[PDB]
Design a protein around this motif. Structure first.
Motif, short mmCIF file in Angstrom:
data_model
loop_
_atom_site.label_atom_id
_atom_site.label_comp_id
_atom_site.label_asym_id
_atom_site.label_seq_id
_atom_site.Cartn_x
_atom_site.Cartn_y
_atom_site.Cartn_z
N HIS A 1 0.63 -1.52 -0.44
CA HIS A 1 0.54 -0.48 -0.22
C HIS A 1 1.17 1.19 -0.33
O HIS A 1 2.28 1.11 0.55
N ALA A 58 4.47 -1.35 1.26
CA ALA A 58 4.41 -2.45 0.09
C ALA A 58 4.36 -1.95 -1.19
O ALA A 58 3.00 -1.64 -1.57
N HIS A 60 3.90 -3.88 -4.08
CA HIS A 60 3.68 -4.68 -4.74
C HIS A 60 4.34 -5.25 -6.19
O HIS A 60 3.18 -5.06 -7.22
N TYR A 129 -5.03 2.21 -6.45
CA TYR A 129 -4.56 3.60 -5.76
C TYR A 129 -5.03 4.59 -6.30
O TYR A 129 -4.65 5.20 -8.10
ZN LIG Z 1 -0.27 -3.11 -0.03
#
Ligand SMILES: [Zn+2]
Ligand SMILES: [Cl-]
Length: 186
Positions: A1, A58, A60, A129
């Motif tokens: 995130h 993170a 990702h 996001y």
């Molecule tokens: Zn994340």
């Protein structure tokens, strides 16, 4: 995130690193109490290199991002957004651990805008996001890509290629993860 640190987002005090709600209920810009509160007005001249940076827990495996503008200072689901940069692979970074810029191109008029960073994470849940920032521009662009919050779902593991990336495109990931040219993103 992750969340955007530069440019400074609207409503920084309440901004979190969660993706947009899957049902689209907080699109655009993570609708909340103070979605469009100016924390710090960001200012850019046409042709000026501006920093784009991120903080979080993170990455990702990276993914793909856009930088987009709208003249709306309080965007809604019906706002028109135009892409000024696409980064396909390696955004916001490739690895976790203890880089990017954008430029306002010729063709953007001086004035006040909302800037959005959008990110489609390579690995993990199929998320979008989005953080939005107030931009003052002192003095050929396609619509922003939307997926994962509108019933269009992307494929896990790939750095997506945007259908309409615009003329300013950076590649920052591993070539072996990059979706094929002309591939369907969702
Ligand atoms: Zn994340
Ligand atoms: Cl990290």
């Amino acid at each position: 995130h992750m969340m955007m640190a530069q440019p400074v987002p609207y409503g920084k005090d309440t901004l979190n690193n969660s993706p947009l709600a899957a049902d689209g209920s907080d699109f655009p810009c993570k609708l909340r109490s103070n979605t469009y509160q100016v924390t710090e007005e960001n200012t850019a001249a046409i042709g000026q290199s501006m920093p784009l940076s991120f903080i979080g827990s993170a990455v990702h495996g990276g993914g793909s991002c856009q930088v987009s503008l709208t003249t709306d200072r309080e965007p809604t689901k019906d706002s028109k957004w135009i892409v000024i940069k696409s980064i396909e692979g390696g955004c916001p970074a490739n690895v976790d651990g203890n880089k990017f810029t954008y430029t306002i191109p010729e063709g953007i008029e001086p004035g006040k805008y909302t800037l959005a960073w959008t990110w489609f994470n390579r690995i993990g849940n199929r998320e979008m996001y989005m953080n939005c920032a107030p931009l003052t521009v002192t003095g050929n662009f396609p619509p922003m890509f939307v997926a994962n919050v509108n019933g269009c779902t992307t494929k896990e593991g790939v750095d997506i290629r945007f259908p309409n990336p615009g003329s300013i495109v950076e590649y920052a990931g591993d070539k072996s993860n990059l979706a094929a040219e002309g591939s369907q993103a969702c």
